[PDB]
């Protein structure tokens, strides 16, 4: 199935929202709504299909001090859900470095196979290239940097198809690419690699 984003125009642009067995990668800057969309999706996936979810749990790997469980409670409450249950169905791991990020995937895979009842159906990686770009400096290190990132990306695609989960990752300037940008006040515009406008609200992301 597909995980709805809450924004009818954004779901239209993605053809029913983000999809499992695929990797959706959003791009943009601080405030474009990458983390805001990620926190919303972590709540959406917990809903039944009539509401725009898959009756599943979420996983959030954080590499940029962006995880805010208070927002998750805020969205779940406003969208009519037990925010205490929502918080229990979100696994979270702060990656300290690139190697930690790679190892966390094994941990995720093992937890996913056990979950297969609310099975994990979404994996969020925010950010994805932060550690790689912060640890491998210069042209002489670019070869190892591109190799590790490609290996992580291969592991991600593997889990998406193996456990039929949706992988949503964030990035800055193989996968389904989306670009996010700010607009009128709290309004943000999404453009594929033609355009959809969403708004960040108390219920998360919506038209």
């Amino acid at each position: 199935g597909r995980i709805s984003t809450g924004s009818k125009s954004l779901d239209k642009l993605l053809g029913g929202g983000i999809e499992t067995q695929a990797i959706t990668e959003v791009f943009g800057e601080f405030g474009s709504g990458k983390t805001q969309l990620a926190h919303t999706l972590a709540v959406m996936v917990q809903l039944p299909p009539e509401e725009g979810g898959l009756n599943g749990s979420a996983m959030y790997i954080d590499t940029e001090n962006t995880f805010r469980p208070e927002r998750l409670r805020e969205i779940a409450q406003n969208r009519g859900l037990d925010p205490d249950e929502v918080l229990d169905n979100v696994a979270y791991a702060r990656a300290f470095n690139s190697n930690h990020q790679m190892q966390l995937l094994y941990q995720a895979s093992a937890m996913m196979v056990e979950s297969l009842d609310r099975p994990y159906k979404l994996l969020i990686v925010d950010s994805l290239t932060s550690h790689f770009r912060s640890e491998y400096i210069g042209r002489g290190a670019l070869a190892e940097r591109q190799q590790k990132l490609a290996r992580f990306l291969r592991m991600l695609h593997r889990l998406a198809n193996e456990f039929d989960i949706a992988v949503f990752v964030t990035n800055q300037v193989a996968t389904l690419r989306v670009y996010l940008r700010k607009g009128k006040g709290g309004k943000r515009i999404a453009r594929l690699i033609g355009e959809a406008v969403f708004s960040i609200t108390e219920k998360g992301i919506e038209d």
């Binding site: 918080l87 229990d88 169905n89 979270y92 791991a93 930690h100 937890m111 056990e114 592991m155």
Partner: peptide
């Protein structure tokens, strides 16, 4: 805290074969 059995963990190593740290916990700290 979210732990995983050594049986499930060794299955995941087979999955990534052709390719201790802190693990996961719920958004409520468990």
């Amino acid at each position: 805290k979210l732990n995983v059995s050594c049986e499930a963990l060794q299955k995941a190593c087979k999955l990534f074969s052709d390719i201790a740290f802190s693990g996961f916990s719920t958004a409520s700290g468990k």
